Amino acid sequence: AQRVTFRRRNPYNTRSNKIKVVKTPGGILRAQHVKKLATRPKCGDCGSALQGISTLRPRQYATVSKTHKTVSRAYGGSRCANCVKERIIRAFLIEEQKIVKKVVKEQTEAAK
Amino acid sequence: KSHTLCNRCGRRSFHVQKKTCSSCGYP
Amino acid sequence: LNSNPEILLRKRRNADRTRIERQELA
Amino acid sequence: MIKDKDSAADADDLESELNAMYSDYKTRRSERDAKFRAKQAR
Amino acid sequence: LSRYVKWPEYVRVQRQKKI
Amino acid sequence: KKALKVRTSATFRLPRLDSYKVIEQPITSETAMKKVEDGNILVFQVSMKANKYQIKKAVKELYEVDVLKVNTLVRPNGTKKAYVRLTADYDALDIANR
RNA sequence: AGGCCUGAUUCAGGCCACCAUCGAAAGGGAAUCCGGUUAAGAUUCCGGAACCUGGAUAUGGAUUCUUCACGGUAACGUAA
RNA sequence: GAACGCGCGAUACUCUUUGAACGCACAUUGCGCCCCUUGGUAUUCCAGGGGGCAAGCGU
Ligand SMILES: [Zn+2]
Asked: Keywords in UniProt for this one (chain A)?
């Protein structure tokens, strides 16, 4: 039933300073400031959370290996699997349509 | 607390909002 | 491991290509 | 890199460039308010 | 855009006097 | 005939603080002497223009001791106090008696 | 209204656009905890324990025939 | 003229911080760049000292 308060300069209940109450090895209750939770990286096309990539603070990514923040597939770590599949299919079909349109133009200009 | 210390003259005449001194005109 | 100090001169980069371009230029 | 010279065509081109620059300057200085853009729309 | 930046003021004035 | 280039750029651009000055005097209060005796910490008064690097260097030069750490504070009377903790190889009391 | 790059030595060439600065101890923000200690100091001192950032460097391992590694249909996994 | 110190300025009964006040800011003793030099293992790192920074197609 012991009351605890902030341990830093800020006296206001702002998002920046949030308090948890913990029992120290001295048998007493004491406050502890909690950091902001990390946010999962999101896909750049659909905005869904990327799978297989660890969730860390922006500056904590500078200290981990590349396998913990990428995926072995192309666009891995930036776009998800379904978006890459759509990109591949769309690019191939667009190229095929360009070929067909070029053949049609060649035929229609071949009359004269 | 409308006024604070003026660096040029040392008086409590530096208006904090206006950033000007009412005694010596600093700056 | 029983070494011997010495100074090594690295090979110049793009020497043959530059020689060819100079020859064509002249 | 063009190795040609024109006597009066150069003067005409220079005058055209100056006129285009002045027109662009007038348009840029006048389009500072959206009322002018709205008037020019109609 | 505003391409007039390709000519400084003195060049523009001395070419305007040419016309 | 004039030979003028076609590719033209779209924009035209324009073509007195030494060891004896750093340490002014030691602090000889009973708390400071207690720190000297027990904590291996020499308490000094230093100039207001000296940082921790200068205090460490000045102590090292003047007293020929190895400094482990320096902690400085500014006293209400406008003077700076420094706690200099020496390395375990040196005894602060021996330096104080010297 | 300025910075950068290329070049067997020829100063030539090339790229880019856009404005100083001030303004938050309640906004954004790299990282420290416990126990003890004073007449009056503590996430600051003491004891133990741990993190963050920047830098120069060495060792082991990988880079598998000699030259920038693999596995799973897949989501994806990995000491590199 | 002001602030802080011992009439004077760390050489204090040479000339600190300022001020028309001048590297940039300023209600912060806050933030930079350049040159020389010295020390701590030292070509790299860290720090100290000294001195500075208000072309045109016109002829
Ligand atoms: Zn997606």
From this structure: Cytoplasm, Ribonucleoprotein, Ribosomal protein
A32 & A57 share domain: no
| Whether A7 contacts A18, CB under 8 Å | no
Q: Which chains touch C (3 or more CB pairs under 8 A)?
A: none
Q: Are residues A50 and A86 in the same domain?
A: yes
Both A47 and A59 in one domain: the answer is: yes
Query: Could you tell me if A28 and A67 lie in one domain?
Result: no
**For strand G, is any atom closer than 7 Å to the CB of A34?**
no
Which structural technique was applied?
cryo-EM
Q: Which amino acid is at D5?
A: K
Token pair 């504070």 is found at: F73
Let me know whether A93 and A60 are in one domain. Answer: yes
Say what the resolution is, in angstroms: 3.1
**What are residue F74's DSSP bridge partners?**
F80
**How far apart, in whole angstroms, are the C-alpha atoms of residue F88 and residue F40?**
8
**Cis peptide leading into B27, omega within 30 of 0?**
yes
Q: Which nucleotide is closest to the Cα of F7 by its C1'? A: G14
Straight-line distance from CA F17 to C1' H36, in Å?
19
D14 to chain E, any CB pair closer than 8 A? The answer is yes
Q: Write out D8-39 in H/E/C secondary structure.
A: HHHHHHHHHHHHHHHHHHHHHHHCCCHHHHHH
Residues A56 and A103 grouped into a single domain: yes
Whether residues A33 and A85 share a domain: the answer is: no
Does residue F81 contact residue F46 with C-beta atoms inside 8 Å?
yes
Instruction: Tell me, yes or no, whether A53 and A30 share the same domain.
Output: no
> How many Å from the CA of F83 to C1' of H34?
36
How many structural domains comprise chain A?
A: 2
Enclosing domain of residue A79: 38-112
Tokens of residue A108, six digits: 């229609």
